[PDB]
């Protein structure tokens, strides 16, 4: 009850006369709603992961995945998952986010070169074949492909860049066949100080596991909430207005009441931000509606006691909130401090300082005893 | 006098987030101090008037 919360705030069983800012009240969301676009066609992950032929590591194959629902449960079906390293995103949450785009970088490397496919790594493949950015966000999936990328006489169709003048920049592909030059003497062909940058892998089934061919796909994401586009498989629910809810607009999670807005978004604008960069309005993915977002009602809770030795009765001030919203919150048990003070109809008074419950507003005027605010005071009187 | 303000640490720092509030409990009584200072300032404003 409010008096016990006062006692725990003061850390004493004895409370003196006064008004104590005890806690904070928040109205709680009643429902959770998710809004996701029309999209139902599954993303072509099978085509990228089960392609008949894979490009060389120095010529890594870039595939664009957009305008589809990204169901990652398919990835678990056709993959032993030798490596499933998701950097910057929790893999178990991959079904819950919307990504602006998906980029699938598919290539084939050696088994021991899998660890080189990571930001900040060093090595032949990392520096001369495929380099990830320092702030890379996405996932890297590596799985053995010996049964499909090996030949008895040797699979020489796969080549890797072993020598280069400078280390490869992030998201940079080098396909030049110019002979590497060591020093200042120009190279006109194979010979002294001249070596071919591209070396054939020569994958063979008889080779060891660490030398067996491995297919590696890097899934690069751009987690921006403005373009939305590709999200996972969540069933969107109905939209409710004028009710404090947990809303999920295309991955943008929040809590508040969504109301009809007079704000006119230009066709390219997807959401609105207040002057201090707080989201103020949003666009419905389905109905293309401009919804004003207002956070659920909250404020401070003060307890007015006449002293614990004089009496155990208390009054409660919900600061800066209408008595109607408070009463509605009790009637729908949405208020956070759940020790509701009994209301008699005359117990509820509307001050400019907030809503006062548990004190009776008399029409006389006395010297202030416990200052409530805005010219209103409270006292223990007959 | 000047404007009396009240700040909620849990709402300002870890707004309606249980994980963040549990992590914030590990910093001790910084917010008891902040709330006490602000309450003193407000009561002092009323005293000034």
């Amino acid at each position: 009850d409010p008096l016990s919360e006062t006692k725990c705030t003061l850390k004493s069983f004895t409370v003196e006369k006064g008004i104590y800012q005890t806690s904070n009240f928040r109205v709680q969301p009643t429902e959770s709603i998710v809004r996701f676009p029309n999209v139902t066609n599954l993303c072509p992950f099978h085509e990228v992961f089960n392609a008949t032929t894979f490009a060389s590591v120095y010529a890594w194959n870039r595939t664009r995945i957009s305008n589809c629902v990204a169901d990652y449960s398919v990835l678990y079906n056709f993959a032993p998952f030798f490596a499933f390293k998701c950097y910057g995103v929790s893999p178990t949450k991959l079904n819950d986010l919307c990504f602006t785009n998906v980029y699938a970088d598919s290539f084939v490397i050696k088994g021991n070169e899998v660890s080189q496919i990571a930001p900040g790594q060093t090595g032949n493949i990392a520096d001369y074949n495929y380099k990830l950015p320092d702030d890379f966000t996405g996932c890297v999936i590596a799985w053995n492909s010996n049964k499909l990328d090996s030949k008895h006489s040797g699979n020489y169709d796969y080549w890797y860049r072993s020598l280069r003048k400078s280390k490869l920049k992030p998201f940079e592909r080098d396909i030049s066949t110019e002979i590497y030059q060591a020093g200042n003497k120009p190279c006109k062909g194979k010979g002294p100080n001249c070596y071919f940058p591209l070396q054939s892998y020569g994958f063979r089934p008889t080779y060891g596991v660490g030398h067996q061919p491995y297919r590696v796909v890097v899934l690069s994401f751009e987690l921006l909430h403005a373009p939305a586009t590709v999200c996972g498989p969540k069933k969107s629910t109905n939209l409710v207005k004028n009710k404090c809810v947990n809303f999920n607009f295309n991955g943008l999670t929040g809590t508040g009441v969504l109301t009809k807005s007079n704000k006119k978004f230009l066709p390219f604008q997807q959401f609105g931000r207040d002057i201090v960069d707080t989201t103020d309005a949003v666009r419905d993915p389905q109905t293309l509606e401009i919804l004003d977002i207002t956070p659920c009602s909250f404020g401070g809770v003060s307890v007015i006691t006449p002293g614990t030795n004089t009496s155990n009765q208390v009054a409660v001030l919900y600061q800066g909130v209408n008595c109607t919203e408070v009463s509605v919150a009790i009637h729908a048990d949405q208020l956070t401090p759940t020790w509701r003070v009994y209301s008699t109809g005359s117990n509820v008074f509307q001050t400019r300082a907030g809503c006062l419950i548990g004190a009776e507003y008399v029409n006389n005027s006395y010297e202030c005893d416990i200052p409530i605010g805005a010219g209103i005071c409270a006292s223990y009187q007959t | 006098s000047m404007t009396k303000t009240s700040v909620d640490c849990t709402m300002y720092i870890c707004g309606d987030s249980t994980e963040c509030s549990n992590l914030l409990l590990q910093y001790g009584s910084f917010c008891t101090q902040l709330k006490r200072a602000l309450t003193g300032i407000a009561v002092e404003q009323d005293k000034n008037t």
């Binding site: 401070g300 | 009396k4 700040v7 909620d8 709402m11 009323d46 008037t49």
Partner: peptide, 29 residues
């Protein structure tokens, strides 16, 4: 003379009314 105010009120930052209203200050003066 004394939205920025709504946005402030939206993250734990509230403003408490003074105990004496402008009418009482005017009465005292």
């Amino acid at each position: 003379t004394l939205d920025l105010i709504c946005a402030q009120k939206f993250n734990g930052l509230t403003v408490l009314p003074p105990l004496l209203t402008d009418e009482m200050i005017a009465q005292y003066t």
